[PDB]
Design a protein around this motif. Structure first.
Motif, PDB file in Angstrom:
ATOM      1  N   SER A 278      33.699  34.925  31.672  1.00  0.00           N
ATOM      2  CA  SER A 278      34.635  33.970  32.643  1.00  0.00           C
ATOM      3  C   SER A 278      34.090  34.028  34.173  1.00  0.00           C
ATOM      4  CB  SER A 278      36.096  34.597  32.545  1.00  0.00           C
ATOM      5  N   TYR A 279      34.562  35.013  34.777  1.00  0.00           N
ATOM      6  CA  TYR A 279      34.203  35.553  36.327  1.00  0.00           C
ATOM      7  C   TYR A 279      33.946  34.154  37.163  1.00  0.00           C
ATOM      8  CZ  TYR A 279      34.136  39.315  33.534  1.00  0.00           C
ATOM      9  OH  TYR A 279      34.671  40.584  32.554  1.00  0.00           O
ATOM     10  N   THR A 280      34.962  33.632  37.646  1.00  0.00           N
ATOM     11  CA  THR A 280      35.038  32.664  38.470  1.00  0.00           C
ATOM     12  C   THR A 280      35.330  32.538  39.998  1.00  0.00           C
ATOM     13  OG1 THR A 280      35.965  30.291  39.008  1.00  0.00           O
ATOM     14  CG2 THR A 280      36.947  31.924  37.273  1.00  0.00           C
ATOM     15  N   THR A 281      36.458  33.347  40.170  1.00  0.00           N
ATOM     16  CA  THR A 281      37.028  33.753  41.501  1.00  0.00           C
ATOM     17  C   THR A 281      36.134  34.816  42.197  1.00  0.00           C
ATOM     18  OG1 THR A 281      39.277  33.129  41.036  1.00  0.00           O
ATOM     19  CG2 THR A 281      39.109  34.559  42.848  1.00  0.00           C
ATOM     20  N   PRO A 282      35.567  35.892  41.735  1.00  0.00           N
ATOM     21  CA  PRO A 282      34.249  36.388  42.135  1.00  0.00           C
ATOM     22  C   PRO A 282      33.061  35.484  42.232  1.00  0.00           C
ATOM     23  CG  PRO A 282      35.216  37.716  40.483  1.00  0.00           C
ATOM     24  CD  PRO A 282      36.035  36.539  40.344  1.00  0.00           C
ATOM     25  N   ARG A 283      32.054  36.017  42.787  1.00  0.00           N
ATOM     26  CA  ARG A 283      31.137  35.521  43.701  1.00  0.00           C
ATOM     27  C   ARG A 283      30.234  34.525  42.722  1.00  0.00           C
ATOM     28  NH1 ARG A 283      27.142  39.787  45.731  1.00  0.00           N
ATOM     29  NH2 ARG A 283      28.928  40.959  46.024  1.00  0.00           N
ATOM     30  N   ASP A 284      29.277  33.413  43.404  1.00  0.00           N
ATOM     31  CA  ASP A 284      28.429  32.593  42.569  1.00  0.00           C
ATOM     32  C   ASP A 284      27.306  32.327  43.248  1.00  0.00           C
ATOM     33  OD1 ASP A 284      29.889  31.387  44.429  1.00  0.00           O
ATOM     34  OD2 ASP A 284      30.481  29.588  43.171  1.00  0.00           O
ATOM     35  N   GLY A 285      26.571  31.274  42.887  1.00  0.00           N
ATOM     36  CA  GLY A 285      25.337  30.690  43.582  1.00  0.00           C
ATOM     37  C   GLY A 285      24.264  31.667  43.523  1.00  0.00           C
TER      38      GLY A 285
ATOM     39  N   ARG B   1      26.697  36.723  37.897  1.00  0.00           N
ATOM     40  CA  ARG B   1      27.695  37.301  37.991  1.00  0.00           C
ATOM     41  C   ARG B   1      28.601  38.220  36.603  1.00  0.00           C
ATOM     42  NH1 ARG B   1      30.405  40.963  41.234  1.00  0.00           N
ATOM     43  NH2 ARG B   1      32.784  40.910  41.114  1.00  0.00           N
TER      44      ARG B   1
ATOM     45  N   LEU C 230      29.190  40.783  34.834  1.00  0.00           N
ATOM     46  CA  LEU C 230      29.372  42.223  34.883  1.00  0.00           C
ATOM     47  C   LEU C 230      30.058  42.647  33.658  1.00  0.00           C
ATOM     48  CD1 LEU C 230      30.866  42.478  38.107  1.00  0.00           C
ATOM     49  CD2 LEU C 230      28.328  42.180  37.300  1.00  0.00           C
ATOM     50  N   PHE C 231      30.891  42.076  33.093  1.00  0.00           N
ATOM     51  CA  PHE C 231      31.625  42.198  31.672  1.00  0.00           C
ATOM     52  C   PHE C 231      31.668  41.106  30.799  1.00  0.00           C
ATOM     53  N   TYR C 232      32.647  40.634  30.252  1.00  0.00           N
ATOM     54  CA  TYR C 232      32.730  39.626  29.464  1.00  0.00           C
ATOM     55  C   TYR C 232      33.574  38.121  29.691  1.00  0.00           C
TER      56      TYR C 232
ATOM     57  N   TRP D 172      23.083  29.637  40.382  1.00  0.00           N
ATOM     58  CA  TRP D 172      24.403  29.628  39.944  1.00  0.00           C
ATOM     59  C   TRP D 172      24.818  29.314  38.637  1.00  0.00           C
ATOM     60  CZ3 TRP D 172      21.778  26.280  42.792  1.00  0.00           C
ATOM     61  CH2 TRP D 172      21.466  24.977  42.452  1.00  0.00           C
TER      62      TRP D 172
END
Ligand SMILES: *[C@@H]1O[C@H](CO)[C@@H](O)[C@H](O)[C@H]1NC(C)=O
Ligand SMILES: *[C@@H]1O[C@H](CO)[C@@H](O)[C@H](O)[C@H]1NC(C)=O
Lengths: 75, 132, 504, 107, 75, 101, 50, 132, 107
Positions: B107-114, B101, B103-105, B117
C-alpha cells in the motif's frame, strides 16, 4: 510437537525384549542425576523447603524425593 | 546497476494465460514494490497492479479483478505476473518498475514517494500479443 | 527519529551532575536521551556480531548402518570377537544368547554374541564457541532535529548526514566517540565484556538455523559427538545413543538405526535464542549492553537562529504513539533559511503559558526555501491541550486530548521498571543515572540477592517456577515467627512474579 | 479513477523553444504527480518526480510546477533528442492513473 | 538418544521471544492433562496413597500434586 | 489384510509463504490463500509507526500463511482379529538326528 | 501397526490417538488434507520484524 | 642452513596411497609446524594440511579429511605425509614448509605469524603423478 | 574457507616499471595476508609477510599495504629476474586459501 505420549505408559510385557527397554530402565534416573549435577544449589533449597513440611523426620525424606524428582522432569 | 530486466515477447491464444518475469539487479530485492503497468500501442500507459517482493502480497486495478495474479521468487529475485483470461484487448507491452517506500506490506501512499516513484528500472518491456 | 513507536523505547529526562548518563542498551528496545540542553539523541543496539569461531563438539543424527557383522562363541569358549571391532568406525555390543545342539555347537547353555554395525553420519551440528572478545556491537546514534520520516530508509547517506552515526564498539577498542557535525560529538563508554555472560554460550548450527545455547546444556546432550579433530573417519565417540542393538527372545541380534533426531533436538532447544550468519559473522539478534555516556561535547546548532516567518503547514495528522509523545510532521513553505521552529503545547489562549515538555529540543529546518519537512515530538499534559506554534497570524493550532492520568503513567512506569528488573537484573540499577550510596548500594544488594537466587534456583522452567512459587506462597501463611514466613512469602512472590513477566 | 486530463494531445516546435504541458486531475492530488517522456519502444528519459523536482542525471532544461490540481511542465529549450511522448502520473488513492499522452515533432 | 537436556533448564531471559516459548508455557500441563485423561484410576490410587501420608489435611493436597506430577513425567 | 486408521506426517515442507500488513485501525487482512486449506496461519499483531508506512501508531494484525506440505509420513494401520494366523509347529521327540532339529 | 520406513511395530491405541502431529484420516491418494497442522510448522514474531 | 628437503617424484596407481618425506636441517625440528601444500600444474597453490613435528598431531583441509595422514620421525627429523585413495586429480606437486609460533600443538591462529609464515623451507618439492 | 580473489590474472611490463596487485578476501582478514612470487618449478623468491613487511634478504623494490580486506602489492622497479607467478595467502580461520595467481612477462 512435543511428542508427550511416552509409550512406557502403555508398555507391553510380553516375553520378548521391548523396543528400547535396555536403554529405558536407566534414563529417568540419569536425567535426574545430570540435573542435580548441573543445579546443586536446588538440593539445599529443597532441603530448606522440605524441612518446613511434615514435622515427622521421616516425611522430610519423602518430600525431598518428591521435590527432587519433580524439579528435573515435569519442570 | 539498479535495473529490472524482463522476459522476451510472447504470443498467446485468447482464453489462455501469459506469464511475464521481472528480475532485479543492483539493489536489495525485498525493498521496492514492483508495479506492473500495461501499454496498448494505440493508447497511453495504464497501471495493472502492484506486488511487494517481500511477502508476495498483491493489489491491482478494478479493470483486472480476478484476471491477474502476481507471485515472487526471493531466491532468484524475480517477479512473475500471470494474466489469465486473455483477450484481443490484452495485446500490449507490459512494464514493471519499483516503488520506493517498501517497508512492510503493499500500500503505502500517505508516506513518502518519488525518486523513481516508479521511473527508472523497467528495462526493455515485454510485448504480449494475443491472437491465433 | 530511529525511536518512533518502537514500544520498548525508554527516554531519560536529565543527566544531572557532570554530564554523565549511563544507559542499558538492548536489541529489543531503544533509549531516547534528553536534558535541559544538548539535543535529544536516540541511542540503540542493533547487531551483536561475532567474528571468529572455534569448533567445540559435533553431534550426529541421521546414521547410516551397514556391513553388520556378528560372531558367537560356544558357551565356554570365551568372549565373542570379530576383526571389525579393531576398525573403531563400527558399533559393538555383546549379548548372551542360547546355544545347544539345535543352535550349532555347544555343551548347552548361554554363549556370547557380538554384533557390529558400520556407523556413518550425514547431518551434524557444528557447535561453535563464543568468547567474550572477538565481537562488535553496532550502535546507531540518532538526533531529533532536521529529519523527516526516517527510521531506516536510505542509510548510506543517512550515515553521512549529521543526524546519524554508526558506532562499532568492541572489547578491543571500547569507549568510542561519534561525530555529529554541528551537533557536536557524543562519547560513550560501553562495557561489551559484561553483556550477556558470554563464554557460557555456544553458537550452534543445525542446517541453516542457528541458536545460542549454554555450554552446560551442550555438553550434556547424549548424541554421538565428534570433538575437533577434522580428520577422515570422524571418530564419533558415543555412537551408542544413535543406534540400538535389539536381539530376539534368545537367538540372533540385529542392529537398529534410531533415525534422524533433528526435530527432537528442535523440541529440546525450547529456550535458546536465534541468530543468523553473514558469511562468517555470527549475527546475534538479542542481547544487551551497559554504557556510560558522555554528553560533554554537544551543541544545539540552533541557538543563534531566527524564527521562521510563515507557511507552517503540518501535513500528517499529529499521530499519538504508544504512551510516548505526539509526533507532528510539519512543512515550511516560504522560509528564508536555517530558522528555528517555534512550537509548544499550551492549555488555551491564556498567555499561552506552555506546559508541554516537548522532547525534540531546539528544532531546526535546513533551508530549502520550499517544502522542507520536520518531525516534532511533544509531551502534552494529560487533560485537554492544544499544540501551538506561537508565531504568525492564524499560526497553526491543533486540539489534543490524552488517555489516562498521572497515576496511570506511574503504574505504567512501575511495570516498565518491573520488566527492567525481570530481564537483565543486576544492571537495571545502572539504567538510571548518578548514584552515590543509593543506586550503587541498591545495585550491590540486588547483586548479592540475584547471585544467591541464580545459584540456588537454576534449572527453573516457567512451570517449575509457578509450582514452587505457589508452594512457598502457601507456606507463607504457615507456622510461625513472622519472619521466615515473610522470607518464604517474599521469595515465592518473586518466583511467581518473574514467571509472569517473561511470558504473560 | 482520479481522471487525469493531459493537455494538449500533441505539439510541434523548432529547436530551442519553450513549451508547457498541463495536467488537471478531477480531485486533489496536491503534490503527487510525476512526469515521463517516453521515446517510442525504448527505455525512456527521466523528467520529474513530485511535480516540481528534477532527478540527478536529468538535464536542467526540464521543470515542473503546480500546487492544487493544475500542473505545468515546462521545457525551456527544445532539442532534437527531446522528441518523445509525454505522460503525467497521479500517485494518490491507488488506481494510479496516467495521462493520455503528449507527442512532439521536430520542425 | 533420548535428548534429555531440555534447554528450558538454561533458558535465556532476553527481551526477544525465545525459540519455542509460546508453545513451551503449556506443554507440561497438557502432557499431565492427557496422562490423567488416559489413566483415571491412578487419581484414586494416588488419593489413597497420599491420604496415608502427612495426617495434616493440607499436606494431603501437596502429596497429591507431588505424585500426580511425578507419574506423567519422571515415570 | 489390514486397514489404515489415522496417519501422521513427521516432516514438513514449507513454501510460498504469504503476508498481510494492514495498517493499524485499517481492519483485518484478506490473503486469499488462507481461504484454501493447504495453508497455515496464526494472525499476530505488529507495532508500527512512521517508519513502517503508517500514519497511526499501534498494532497491525498480520499473518503470513505458508503452504504446508508433507514428505515421509508415518502410517498407523489397524488390525482386528480377522485375517490373522499363527503357524504353530509340532516336533515329537521320538527318534531324530542332530541335523533334523 | 505403526509404520515409518520399512520397519513396523505394534502400538497401543490410546498412545496412538494421543500424538499431536497431522492426521491424514483415511488414505494417501494424491496429496491429502492435512489436519491439525500446528505441531509442525511454527512461525513467530520478535522485534516486530517479519 | 634452515632447509626442508623432500623425496623424489613418484608415479602411483589410482586407488593406491603415496608417501612423501620432508626432512629438516639447520633448526630445531620440534619448533616449526610442517604445512603440506599441493599445486596442480594447471592451478595455483592449495593448502593440504599441517602437522606438528612435536607430538605428531595433525589437521587438514575439508577437501581431504579421511584421505590424508601425517606422521613424524623425531629421530631422523622427518615428516611423512601419506595420501590415500589417489585419483587422477591428485597428479600435482607437493610442498612442505614451516611457520613458527609452533610451541605446543595444532595450529596457533591468533598468536603471531610471518617471517617464513611458511615461506623459506620448501626446497625442491615432490612431483606425484597418478596414472596407469 | 575465505575466498581470496587476486586481480588481475596476468600482466606484462618493461624493465623498470611500477606495478600493483590487488587481493580481496570475502571476509575480514585484517592484516593476515602475505605474498609469494614463484618462479616456475623452482625454489621461489620472498616478497611479503603480514601484508606490509619485508623480510631480510629481500630487495627493497617490493612493498605491500592494505588495511581492511583490500591489499595492494607494489613493485617499484620491474627487473628481468622478477618474472614469476605471484600469489597471496590468507592467514585466518585455517582453511588457508591462496589466490589464483598473477603471471608476468618481460617485454
Ligand atoms: C532517501 O533517498 C533520497 C534520494 O535517494 C534522499 O534525498 C533522502 O535523504 C533519503 N532519505 C533519508 C531519510 O535520508
Ligand atoms: C533336512 O531334511 C531334508 C528332507 O526334507 C533332507 O533332504 C536334508 O538332508 C535335511 N538336512 C539336514 C541338515 O538334516
Amino acid at each position: 510437537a512435543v511428542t508427550l505420549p511416552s509409550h512406557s505408559t502403555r508398555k507391553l510385557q510380553t516375553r520378548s525384549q521391548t523396543w528400547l527397554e535396555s536403554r529405558e530402565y536407566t534414563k529417568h534416573l540419569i536425567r535426574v542425576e545430570n540435573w542435580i549435577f548441573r543445579n546443586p544449589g536446588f538440593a539445599l533449597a529443597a532441603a530448606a523447603i522440605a524441612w518446613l513440611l511434615g514435622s515427622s523426620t521421616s516425611q522430610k525424606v519423602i518430600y525431598l524425593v518428591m521435590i527432587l524428582l519433580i524439579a528435573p522432569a515435569y519442570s | 546497476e539498479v535495473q529490472l530486466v524482463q522476459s522476451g515477447p510472447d504470443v498467446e491464444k485468447p482464453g489462455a494465460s501469459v506469464k511475464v518475469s521481472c528480475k532485479a539487479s543492483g539493489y536489495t530485492f525485498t525493498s521496492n514494490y514492483i508495479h506492473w503497468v500495461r501499454q496498448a500501442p494505440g493508447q497511453g500507459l495504464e497501471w495493472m497492479g502492484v506486488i511487494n517482493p517481500r511477502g508476495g502480497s498483491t493489489a491491482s486495478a478494478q479493470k483486472f479483478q480476478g484476471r491477474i495474479t502476481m507471485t515472487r521468487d526471493t531466491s532468484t529475485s524475480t517477479v512473475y505476473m500471470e494474466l489469465s483470461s486473455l483477450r484481443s484487448d490484452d495485446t500490449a507491452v507490459y512494464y514493471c518498475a519499483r516503488g520506493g517506500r517498501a517497508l512492510f506490506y503493499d500500500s503505502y501512499t500517505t508516506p513518502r514517494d518519488g525518486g523513481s516513484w516508479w521511473f527508472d528500472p523497467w528495462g526493455q518491456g515485454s510485448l504480449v500479443t494475443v491472437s491465433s | 527519529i530511529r525511536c518512533i513507536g518502537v514500544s520498548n523505547r525508554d527516554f531519560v529526562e536529565g543527566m544531572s551532575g557532570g554530564t554523565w548518563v549511563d544507559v542499558v542498551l538492548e536489541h529489543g528496545g531503544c533509549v531516547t536521551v534528553m536534558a535541559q540542553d544538548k539535543p535529544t539523541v536516540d541511542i540503540e543496539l542493533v547487531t551483536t556480531t561475532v567474528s571468529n569461531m572455534a569448533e567445540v563438539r559435533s553431534y550426529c543424527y541421521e546414521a547410516s548402518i551397514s556391513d553388520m557383522a556378528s560372531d558367537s562363541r560356544c558357551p565356554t569358549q570365551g568372549e565373542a570377537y570379530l576383526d571389525k571391532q579393531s576398525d573403531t568406525q563400527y558399533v559393538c555390543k555383546r549379548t548372551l544368547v542360547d546355544r545347544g545342539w539345535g543352535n550349532g555347537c555347544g555343551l548347552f547353555g548361554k554363549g556370547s554374541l557380538v554384533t557390529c554395525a558400520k556407523f556413518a553420519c550425514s547431518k551434524k551440528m557444528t557447535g561453535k564457541s563464543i568468547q567474550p572478545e572477538n565481537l562488535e556491537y553496532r550502535i546507531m546514534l540518532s538526533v531529533h532535529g532536521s529529519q523527516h520520516s526516517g527510521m531506516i530508509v536510505n542509510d548510506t547517506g543517512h550515515e553521512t548526514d549529521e543526524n546519524r552515526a554508526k558506532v562499532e564498539i568492541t572489547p578491543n577498542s571500547p569507549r568510542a566517540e561519534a561525530t555529529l557535525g554541528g551537533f557536536g560529538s557524543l562519547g560513550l563508554d560501553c562495557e561489551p565484556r559484561t553483556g550477556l555472560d558470554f563464554s557460557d554460550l555456544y553458537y550452534l548450527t543445525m542446517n541453516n538455523k542457528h541458536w545460542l545455547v549454554h555450554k552446560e546444556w551442550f555438553h550434556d546432550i547424549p548424541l554421538p559427538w565428534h570433538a575437533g579433530a577434522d580428520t577422515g573417519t570422524p571418530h564419533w565417540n558415543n555412537k551408542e545413543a544413535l543406534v540400538e542393538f535389539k536381539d530376539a527372545h534368545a537367538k540372533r541380534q540385529t542392529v537398529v538405526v534410531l533415525g534422524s533426531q533433528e526435530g527432537a533436538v528442535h523440541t529440546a532447544l525450547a529456550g535458546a535464542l536465534e541468530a543468523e550468519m553473514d558469511g562468517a559473522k555470527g549475527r546475534l539478534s538479542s542481547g544487551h549492553l551497559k554504557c556510560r555516556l558522555k554528553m560533554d561535547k554537544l551543541r544545539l546548532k540552533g541557538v543563534s537562529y531566527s524564527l521562521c516567518t510563515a507557511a507552517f503547514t503540518f501535513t500528517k495528522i499529529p499521530a499519538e504513539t504508544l504512551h510516548g509523545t505526539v509526533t507532528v510532521e510539519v512543512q515550511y513553505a516560504g522560509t528564508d533559511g536555517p530558522c528555528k521552529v517555534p512550537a509548544q503545547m499550551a492549555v488555551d489562549m491564556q498567555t499561552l503559558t506552555p506546559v508541554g515538555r516537548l522532547i525534540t529540543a531546539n528544532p531546526v529546518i535546513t533551508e530549502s526555501t520550499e517544502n522542507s519537512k520536520m518531525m516534532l515530538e511533544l509531551d502534552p499534559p494529560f487533560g485537554d491541550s492544544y499544540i501551538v506554534i506561537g508565531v504568525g497570524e492564524k499560526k497553526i493550532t491543533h486540539h489534543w486530548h490524552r488517555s489516562g492520568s498521572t497515576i496511570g503513567k506511574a503504574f505504567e512506569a512501575t511495570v516498565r521498571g518491573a520488566k527492567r528488573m525481570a530481564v537483565l537484573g543486576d544492571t537495571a540499577w545502572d539504567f538510571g543515572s548518578v548514584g552515590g550510596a543509593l543506586n550503587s548500594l541498591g545495585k550491590g544488594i540486588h547483586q548479592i540477592f540475584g547471585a544467591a537466587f541464580k545459584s540456588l534456583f537454576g534449572g527453573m522452567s516457567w512451570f517449575s517456577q509457578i509450582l514452587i512459587g505457589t508452594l512457598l506462597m502457601w507456606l507463607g501463611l504457615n507456622t510461625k515467627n513472622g519472619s521466615i514466613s515473610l522470607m518464604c512469602l517474599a521469595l515465592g512472590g518473586v518466583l511467581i512474579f518473574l514467571s509472569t513477566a517473561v511470558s504473560a | 479513477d482520479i481522471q487525469l486530463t493531459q493537455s494538449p494531445s500533441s505539439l510541434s516546435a523548432s529547436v530551442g523553444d519553450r513549451v508547457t504541458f498541463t495536467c488537471q486531475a478531477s480531485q486533489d492530488i496536491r503534490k503527487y504527480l510525476n512526469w515521463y517522456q517516453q521515446k517510442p519502444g525504448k527505455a525512456p528519459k527521466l523528467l520529474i518526480y513530485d511535480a516540481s523536482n528534477l532527478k540527478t542525471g536529468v538535464p536542467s532544461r526540464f521543470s515542473g510546477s503546480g500546487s492544487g490540481t493544475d500542473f505545468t511542465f515546462t521545457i525551456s529549450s527544445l532539442q532534437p533528442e527531446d522528441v518523445a511522448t509525454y505522460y503525467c502520473q497521479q500517485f494518490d488513492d491507488l488506481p494510479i492513473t496516467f495521462g493520455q499522452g503528449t507527442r512532439l515533432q521536430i520542425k
